Amino acid sequence: TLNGGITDMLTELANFEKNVSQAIHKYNAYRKAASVIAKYPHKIKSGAEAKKLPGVGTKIAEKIDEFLATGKLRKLEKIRQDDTSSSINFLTRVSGIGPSAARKFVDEGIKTLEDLRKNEDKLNHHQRIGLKYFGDFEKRIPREEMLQMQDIVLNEVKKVDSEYIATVCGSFRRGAESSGDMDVLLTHPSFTSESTKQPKLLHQVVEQLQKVHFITDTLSKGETKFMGVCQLPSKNDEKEYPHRRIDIRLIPKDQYYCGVLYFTGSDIFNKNMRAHALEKGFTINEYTIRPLGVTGVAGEPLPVDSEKDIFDYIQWKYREPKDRSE
DNA sequence: CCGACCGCGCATCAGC
DNA sequence: GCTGATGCGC
DNA sequence: GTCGG
Ligand SMILES: Nc1nc2c(ncn2[C@H]2C[C@H](O)[C@@H](COP(=O)(O)OP(=O)(O)[C@H](F)P(=O)(O)O)O2)c(=O)[nH]1
Ligand SMILES: [Cl-]
Ligand SMILES: [Cl-]
Ligand SMILES: [Cl-]
Ligand SMILES: [Cl-]
Ligand SMILES: [Cl-]
Ligand SMILES: [Mg+2]
Ligand code: NA
Ligand code: NA
Ligand code: NA
Secondary structure, eight states, X not given: OXXXXXXXXXXXXXXXXXXXXXXXXXXXXXXXXXXXXXXXXXXXXXXXXXXXXXXXXXXXXXXXHHHHHHSSOHHHHHHHHOHHHHHHHHHTTSTXXXXXXXXXXXHTTOOSHHXXXXXXXXXXXXXXXXXXXXXGGGSOEEHHHHHHHHHHHHHHHHHHOTTOEEEEOHHHHXXXXXXXXXXXXXXXXXXXXXXXXXXXXXXXXXXXXXXXXXXXXXXXXXXXXXXXXXXXXXXXXXXXXXXXXXXXXXXXXXXXXXXXXXXXOOHHHHHHHHHHXXXXXXXXXXXXXXXXXXTOOBXXXXXXXXXXXHHHHTTOOOOXXXXXXX
């Protein structure tokens, strides 16, 4: 919050570029600048001061000057007044409606919450569930609820098969006092890079969580990734908890450390880290870290025994999850 | 300059 | 059906 | 929009 004013501005600009201009590199450019500035341990006093930070260029430096002088940005003022941009920005808040779908809906004169509701038949399944829980999915989850949710998921998974290991990642693993959703990494010894010795590994876990009425909706589901909806159980007479987004990612057990690094994030941290990997001549995904041949062809997976081995390869000092919140 | 910008699972569609 | 590109979300 | 070379 030290430079919250500026970081909010850049985020609003990032969002505009993603949702409206559909210009994803501009989106990431703003996001990066915002991240670098939020980290910065001084209250910024000028665009020039900011332009010292990596990712802040001439254009963002000028905007910071405008913002510092007036408390606002004319460019954003006009964006907010623009009915089309506002409408598009709103619709993209519904899970499953991206920039493209949003702009189409608006072309059809579907541009409000009331419009979506009376046009349920125009929505695919994911979008349908995003509209249903539009309000709930806006709310954050107190760590205390995250802790109850973890207890359920782990215990239920243990009931299915004691050899399952479920690890809650995302901001929860980074120590955050609230999380926008729940991210669960799942492994089982029968699923490795070498073989899948047991089918329905993910399905069976999902099934059991539906059985106890923890999972209530499915956004999408495949052999290794589930994205859906869950809800804590509430006591007699007490108001129900909000429905929450959940994702479960089944990863080969022998690739746990690359998987847990991936699912811990943050997203910006992953981008920064894989970008650095590339500078050092490696490529990192949720499975492996591989060298890049002189051609730039990924080589064979390097041995990984801890998250720190991954950091080591790219010559980064290790960073605890709680210091990966970029 | 100017090319590169992380990497990939699932849904959905076009074209064969 | 299949492959491949695209959207969208992680 | 920014940066590396
Ligand atoms: N390489 C890469 N990894 C990505 C990306 N988006 C999400 N991830 C990874 C890292 C997240 O922590 C993890 C979960 O994705 P997330 O969107 O839930 O983020 P998160 O870190 O959990 C948020 F802080 P919260 O949800 O708690 O409010 O998925 C992406 O674009 N690229
Ligand atoms: Cl772009
Ligand atoms: Cl403003
Ligand atoms: Cl690994
Ligand atoms: Cl791989
Ligand atoms: Cl930590
Ligand atoms: Mg999360
Ligand atoms: Na800079
Ligand atoms: Na959306
Ligand atoms: Na998630």
